[PDB]
Symmetry: C5
Subunit: 307 residues, 5 copies
């Protein structure tokens, strides 16, 4: 095979779309292999700029195509340089821009700890014809800085693995596995905006929903709970635009569920308190000891749910 050395530079990571679970990564790729010795004008290496490499490719120069596996849509490439040394090595430098995708598990939404994965693999040549020697990822632009609400932490993990493509084994009998480079960049979500915009207001809504039992008569406490339910409904919408449709529940969706549960349990308890009287003579105070018991049970529920 041909020993190909890659040096991926990351310019910036931007536009991390949580709803679509995609992100956009800019930067440069510098692939370098070796070939036969060639003659250049002077001792200096030749610079082959874009839209003119095609004359060299139609001349017979071996320029492989390196594609991104996990990309969404066509990667919007820009300028490209094919720098030709006369000692033998050929260097393909290109700028890439594309939307990449990952799994992006969302069990803990505001306190999330995710990673951004770049995958590179030759489109046509397998590991018997093109082998990745090593990659050095230069994430010095975003090594210790925060993009949007994501704090990039650590360096970039590099890994070279041989992926196997069983769909291509009908045209290649034995050699049908490809050398893939994986680049992993960790990212920790900053939870401050969610903390002061969704979590603590909903805690205040929960305390206000607890405040129904301090009232004195029945219609006023029903109307208190109804306008409280209105608030919880409105809040549920606010969360929609912050995270996609998930089979599980996150922290904020669990808080919405707890708000609905608290308010409707209060309404049902108030109804059962009102219809407690068989002949309309009994006072209703024995069941209304939930001024100091219902918040305690709610705190126990929250403490269990945190762990």
């Amino acid at each position: 095979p041909v020993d190909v050395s890659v040096s991926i530079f990351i310019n910036k990571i931007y536009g991390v779309n949580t709803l679509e679970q995609t992100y956009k990564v800019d930067g440069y790729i510098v692939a370098q292999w070796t070939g036969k010795p060639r003659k250049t004008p002077g001792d200096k290496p030749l610079i082959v700029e874009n839209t003119q490499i095609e004359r060299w490719i139609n001349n017979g120069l071996w320029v492989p195509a390196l594609e991104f596996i996990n990309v969404v849509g066509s990667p919007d490439t820009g300028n490209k340089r094919l720098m030709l040394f006369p000692d033998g090595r050929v260097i393909y430098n290109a700028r890439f821009l594309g939307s990449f995708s990952n799994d992006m598990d969302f069990r803990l939404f505001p306190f999330d700890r995710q990673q951004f994965v770049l995958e590179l693999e030759p489109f046509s040549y397998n590991n018997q014809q093109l082998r990745f020697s090593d990659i050095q990822v230069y994430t010095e632009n975003i090594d210790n800085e925060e993009i949007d609400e994501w704090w990039i932490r650590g360096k970039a993990s590099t890994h070279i693995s041989d992926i196997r493509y069983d769909h291509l084994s009908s045209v290649q009998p034995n050699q049908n596995e490809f050398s893939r480079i994986t680049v992993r960049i960790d990212a920790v979500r900053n939870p401050s905006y969610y903390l002061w915009s969704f979590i603590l207001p909903l805690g205040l809504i929960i305390a206000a929903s607890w405040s129904v039992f301090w009232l004195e008569s029945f219609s006023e406490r029903l109307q208190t709970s109804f306008t409280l339910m209105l608030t919880v409904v409105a809040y549920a919408f606010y969360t929609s635009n912050i995270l996609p449709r998930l089979p599980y529940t996150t922290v904020i969706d669990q808080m919405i569920i707890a708000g609905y549960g608290s308010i409707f349990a209060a309404i049902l308890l108030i109804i059962f308190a009102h219809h407690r009287q068989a002949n309309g003579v009994e006072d209703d105070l024995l069941i209304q000891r939930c001024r100091l018991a219902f918040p305690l049970g709610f705190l126990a529920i929250g403490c269990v749910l945190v762990i």
Copy 2:
């Protein structure tokens, strides 16, 4: 005709847009036919990368164009390889990315069970000049995994059928039918998010709407029902962004309809209870036996509506 063998690899299915009834499918296509024996440099097969196939096509090589019938917009193709063996066969490998469309029947919205259809057909050569022998679809990347809220279940159904184009019979007298490949991938929607975000909150709203009859006087129970109607209105909006405009009603839209019906039937019943008095002396308890009859009728309605 020419026997063409296709091997479609599916990389990932993403972005299933329910409102537009489209979805995006990435992956590779490997078409393979046979031709005259040719000579290559060495015994090894020749690899013809992208943007250089045109020299071979202008030289006179037969490379058919395979289009997607059910695609929405232009399919955003990427890299392509035209691998030439010297024993005779020509292999056209290409990467595709495009938005596909299907019927996507939506009778049961959250408990839906849909399929994703890929259709492939030659644009110009009919079955008398190009015949699809067989297709093996390698859906091993998403065989037993869930994309977004869709759990992909089973393998990919393959079918080769001869579709007939009557619009082209004016230029082709007898042979005007084309061989189309259909690839069917089943998908079952995960109903959990809808279950805890729309169905059970609306059930709590229904119980709260039932709670009007436990009040004691008239203006308070009218205001109770009015703020309850407000909630149902708000909920109706939340559903809009989850499913398109349909002639029929789904489960959630039927729940909104049942909420409106319950609240307005309660308001009309309360009004008729108030105006039951001919001279203002009669008590109103005979018509207010709906504390234990109106929910029973609603449960009967729901049980009939489920089946």
Copy 3:
């Protein structure tokens, strides 16, 4: 002139955007004219696939360009075949995809009855150099089926007319008129979703707004009407995302107007009832005979407004 025969095939009509008054039409166009006899390899006709027609065009073959007049944006063309018979005729087959536009009058919004218009006209050759003989439109894919909320009814109307371009008369003295093909596909909007989502809920809101006069005192009936107005406001928004900004009023906007009018007329009547007392001794029942007169006038208003 040259007699050109067109056979437009319609694959699917999708994405009818009411707010933008555009729609997207896929399918194929098959133009066919006649020319000098030519020699082909063998007796079989020659197939000229895409991205290779340019060699024949630079060789000197007459391939006219047919553009779409009413299109919005560039029509996203795909594959194209230039099928050359040796008996003389040249057949240009191409696939088109583009957003088309029409007037789309919206007097009756949910019970609308619209049409989809495709217009085709040569860009450069007038009727003295290129004449459309006839068109057969093959709308067999959507002849008797419903797209989105639009039920396609009937076949496709064909018409050939000579349009006149006065802007081009400075460069062409007498012959400056072009032969345009118009294809009309009727479509009837399915009113069910609007009927059970906007019309009947707003009727329930109207009845609830009528329900104010059954109350007994003043502050409660003012608050009843205020929360009712809140509902009407919310509903007005829901309609915004369903139809564009229009100088006139549709059915649903007239229902919103009637809701505002009913509620504010009720508020003004209640205020005038309260201030009817010169010395605070008169009872207010003479002006509150609108329990059985205000709905009757509203029904008369609605019956007049329907016709």
Copy 4:
């Protein structure tokens, strides 16, 4: 210089985006200059269709590039004809489609009276090498018709002016000014939809906010004003999606401001009426003469604000 005559045809103006202050204009451009006499096949003029003009341009034909100065993004050109007469003149006909921009002053929002400006200027040749003789704009398609909510009024104003580019004076010593064509199309916004959707409902909200002073006690009138403020808040949002962020206030934003001012002045006046009692014995009627004075002052404010 070379005398260039332009004849701009306007097909349709659509998609006037008020928030972005852009609009989309379709149509054709017909540029015509004169040159050396040439020989054509026969006496007829030659038609040079698109994607084949490049052979004539590489042959040495002078085809200038005319760009649009005020365009947003790349103007999506379509088909183009380079019609060559043998008597000497060369005619460049092209179809354009692009998003144009203007200042679009918005002092009176619903009763606005705007214009749509098209600017054309050669990219490379100044007025010493290419001079625009005259332009005739053929706006006969939209001369007396209304697009969206904009009624196009009058014809299209034509003007040829020499614009000066000081950035290019480092490479051109004296001749660095360019001949620009400006095309002005007036448009009057139809105010009906805003009149019955925002202005008159907000007037009803204003009258309902005036209705607080007719109540009898304090808590009910505070709650009346609070639910009224809720309505005004909701209305403020509805306006957001109709006009961009502006330093000044339009009519509708002034109505929102007047609604907030009326309601909060009523709340402050009610509070000062309640705390008017030094010992709780005084009646509060002297300050509540605003049943017939507060609307009069509001009418004076509105009459001053209109002029």
Copy 5:
């Protein structure tokens, strides 16, 4: 190296997207270097228009590619002129259009004072082979005018710095640093729209929330505070569409936080006032001296928070 002189002209800055922290800059770039003397037809300089420069580039002319570092997506270039003087200098004039990005710190949101940064750097040639001599930025189109809600103030700051690329040092031993031009355009946000749309309405909401303590009994003051909280919730949403997710709090988000704090502190104080009675005989006036103390503390909080 080669001395390259740049003269950037700015046509217009538009579409400053605060949520994405990007902006769009149109205009022209005029690069100029020197080379060997050449012969042109006549004494006049040669004009090389677009899509024909490639013949000169394949002939062997040195045209460097200048890229934008901070751009988002591919910069949508338009027409380009390569003006060749016979005295030796080569002038590359091109039009650019692209979305640029900056840090855009948002500590004070409505009273913001930002800058727009354009960065230009050769893609392939380092400072040993191409050196930027000087840049004159001609921002005369927007020198003293306001774009959208941004008032452009001052001229454009020019700076030439040598940036160092450590990722490219594996292919270049010592010379691996590039000359970058930075263009800084200051912009001050106009705070009027936010001042009369968010700040003063929320101040009125704060005063209305203070108004709870003037009521007389308990259930009415709880319901007053609940409908007030509803308003604050609604307002929080309005702000979402005006600024992105930030770790810190701006002015308007601090006002939302203060509204929630004031209302929930009022609710807690009212609850503690109600449960102040050990046996139900004590009057509650000592803790309700916050009619003239709670606003004073709120004013102290606001005065501290401003500085």
